[PDB]
Amino acid sequence: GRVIRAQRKSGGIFQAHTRLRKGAAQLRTLDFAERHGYIRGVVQKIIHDP
Amino acid sequence: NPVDHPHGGGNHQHVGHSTTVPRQSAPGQKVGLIAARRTGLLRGAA
Amino acid sequence: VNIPKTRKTYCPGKNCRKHTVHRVTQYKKGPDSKLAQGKRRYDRKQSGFGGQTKPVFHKKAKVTKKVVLRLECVSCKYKNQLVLKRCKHFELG
RNA sequence: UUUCAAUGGCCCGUCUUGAAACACGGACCAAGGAGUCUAGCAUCUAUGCGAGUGUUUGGGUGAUGAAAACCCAUCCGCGAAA
RNA sequence: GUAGAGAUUCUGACGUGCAAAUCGAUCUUCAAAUUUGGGUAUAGGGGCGAAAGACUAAUCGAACCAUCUAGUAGCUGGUUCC
RNA sequence: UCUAGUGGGCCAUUUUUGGUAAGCAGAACUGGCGAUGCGGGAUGAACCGAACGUGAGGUUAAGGUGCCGGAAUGUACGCUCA
RNA sequence: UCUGCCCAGUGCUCUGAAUGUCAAAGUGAAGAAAUUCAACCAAGCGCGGGUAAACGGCGGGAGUAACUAUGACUCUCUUAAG
RNA sequence: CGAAACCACAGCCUGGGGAACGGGCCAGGCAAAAUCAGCGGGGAAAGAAGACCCUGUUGAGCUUGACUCUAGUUUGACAUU
RNA sequence: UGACAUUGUCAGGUGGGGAGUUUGGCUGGGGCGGCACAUCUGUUAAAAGAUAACGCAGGUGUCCUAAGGGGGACUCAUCGAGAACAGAAAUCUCGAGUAGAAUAAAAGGGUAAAAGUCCCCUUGAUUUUGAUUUUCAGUGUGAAUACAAACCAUGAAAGUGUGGCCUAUCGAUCCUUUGUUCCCUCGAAAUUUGAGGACAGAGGUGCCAGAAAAGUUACCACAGGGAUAACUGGCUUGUGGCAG
RNA sequence: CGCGGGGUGGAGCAGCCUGGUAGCUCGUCGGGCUCAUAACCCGAAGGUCGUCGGUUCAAAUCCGGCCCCCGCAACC
RNA sequence: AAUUUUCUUU
Ligand SMILES: [Zn+2]
């Protein structure tokens, strides 16, 4: 037979389109400030991630 | 066509075999409903 | 066919070259020992990659089998083999 | 040699029971074009020797001029026994 | 409905053609799932496929190149002087 | 003793079998073609005669003697008008 | 707007409660050793399920309702099912 | 100015026989140079070692509870320990 | 998280996801059907022998410790006439009775103080060697015939018996297994296990001189075949029609 | 082939291991009663426990062989 | 628990 589309989705053509994305949405590195107290940040932008 | 997919081929568009395939299926035949505990319309359950 | 458990027939033994009484039993195939040279050769051939290396019979004509009688000398302790025609039922006594 | 006259004469090769075939190949010409060599075997024939037969695996005349011819020892192959 | 992109019918022209797919009329679509240049990635039991076994350099129900390879053929053809 | 080719057959008389029958299929005997040229049946593998080196002369076979065409528009007795 | 009935079959899943299996290794019974029995590993199944907006399956015979025609209602027949 | 396809040799018909529809064979009808433009009856016209069917102890694409295997996957034993 | 898991080796299961390969022959084309593929009887078979068709009628892969062997006794199937019976020739009788019965199974042949029925005894349905017949290439297999060397059975004995009254009833190499011998070998010398040999059987190939084998191609390919089908003609007239 | 399981009235099922007496349901048959129709009633039978052999004071049972069916596993 | 039916008239 022939390799099916599911097997062909291993990468290459079927990679994610991430040019317009603004960055990974990870929270933060767990540091001493977050482990023993708190840290105050100010939100400055709210953007749409394609 | 049969060369393309396990569901391809036949004089009518039909799967021919059950679409519920075992969990430990080889790649290329693990198509349809993989390791389906149940199938069909359900009316009321948890 | 019915065969008596005892028959008086010619004994080909060295110490009994006359007609003596022999006990009659049906011969049966042996237990197919694994130390036979053919068995060792077959196992060596089958080992490794290549699949089945010898023919395997699949057609089963001739439902019956030939009957082999094992005559045993009462005192001479000599065993002789006789062949009967093909039959579907065999019985002793 | 040409031509005429009388009579006879179907296009070659091939497969085939059967080809002129409405069976296949062939427009023409020149050159090329297909049972060879080798390891064996079998029969027959010729030659040499003969209960023996086989010098060239090898060594020498060797240097001349020597892929040749010539000479030389022990094994060994086949045969002499099944 | 123009440009652009396609190709329904005439089963028109041509069909040793202008052309190994063209020409004319007619027709579909034409502000988006649109068309397209350049760069780049996916390579042969692999790629890619809005899925026709379609496309992958005039080659696709498994591309091209060289080698194994002078592959095998119980089949076809041929096989040279009296 | 060694070895080649052959291992698709076919036609006619007679004896037949299966079929409505067949230029059909399958058997037996013999003679042939295949591999058989020549004379005759206008033409033809099998039918008739006859089996073939190159020629001369003679005589025939089967078949013919109105012309084509070599040979009596011969002889005798009858029948027939389509 | 509906998507009716069906888990007997084949697929799927599940607890392995079947313990009903049984390859390597390990334990012991013999032998002087090479060499047999018990036990074990999961199964998948035998069960349960799901149930078709998953593979697939889903007729006919009879009494008939004022007859017997009828062909609504009814009941068994394969059942997975009118 | 200037080809190509095709080409055993060639080319008027009837009947017969024949590999069962002949241009050639047999018997007849006949038969006079060299040419032009059309034409589509015939040459069983041309192309292409029938794509239909059968045979081959020839293949390939595809399918499956065909035979033999295999990537993978599952479980166990041994080592890491 | 943690001596688990991962990884390495081996083993069991699964695995058209993938690989390789097969998927008979005859055949009035092939396919379906069937076995005419190994065999037997009558006929086709044309009075020596041989002789085909998917010609006709049918059989066989079994069965029998007796349905084998020997000996002895009797004669069968039917028909007529009888007895009580009560249709029943049930049974028991006398005559006629060339086989019109039986002989395991198809058919043909053979058989009457038997080859049939009954009774008695037995295991010649035993070991071994050569010769011969049929199918034949005078190879094999199967089957069969007449002898020989032993041991037997049965009869008083002459004799008969090496399976079934005769014509069918079955199987190579390799491998496995059994039996056999004061049997041979394991090649440095020994003992015991084990293994390998020679001889005689069995386990089977029915496609029966004996491969281990499922389909599709309406996407298809190659070498060929008019040995072979559809078309193409030709031949034939079984049907229909038409004419006496 | 190796192992394991089953066969029981006309039908479908227990009993076997807990040898001492073969039972249940469906079904058939017998009714007089619900004044009279349906409907109903209780009981009765119906089994070589597939075949053969062995055992014991005694076998469907326990054991072994055979016939049929089924499941697993293997198959020069 | 369980209890269906009583033709058209005199
Ligand atoms: Zn003895």
Q: How far apart are CA C34 and CA C56, in angstroms?
A: 18
The alpha carbon of B8 and the centre of ligand 1 are apart by a number of angstroms equal to 77
Which nucleotide has the least CA–C1' distance to B8? E51
Chain A contacts to B (CB-CB under 8 A): 1-7
CA distances from C68 to C2, C3, C28, C86 (A): 13, 11, 8, 10
**C1' of J10 to CA of C90 (Å):** 37
Q: Distance from first CA to last CA of chain C, Å, rounded? A: 10
Instruction: Specify the experimental method.
Output: cryo-EM
**Closest listed residue to residue C6, CA positions, set C68, C74, C67:** C74
Tokens in use for A42? 């100010």
Please give the single-letter amino acid code of residue C76: C
Q: Do B31 and A3 touch (CB under 8 A)?
A: no
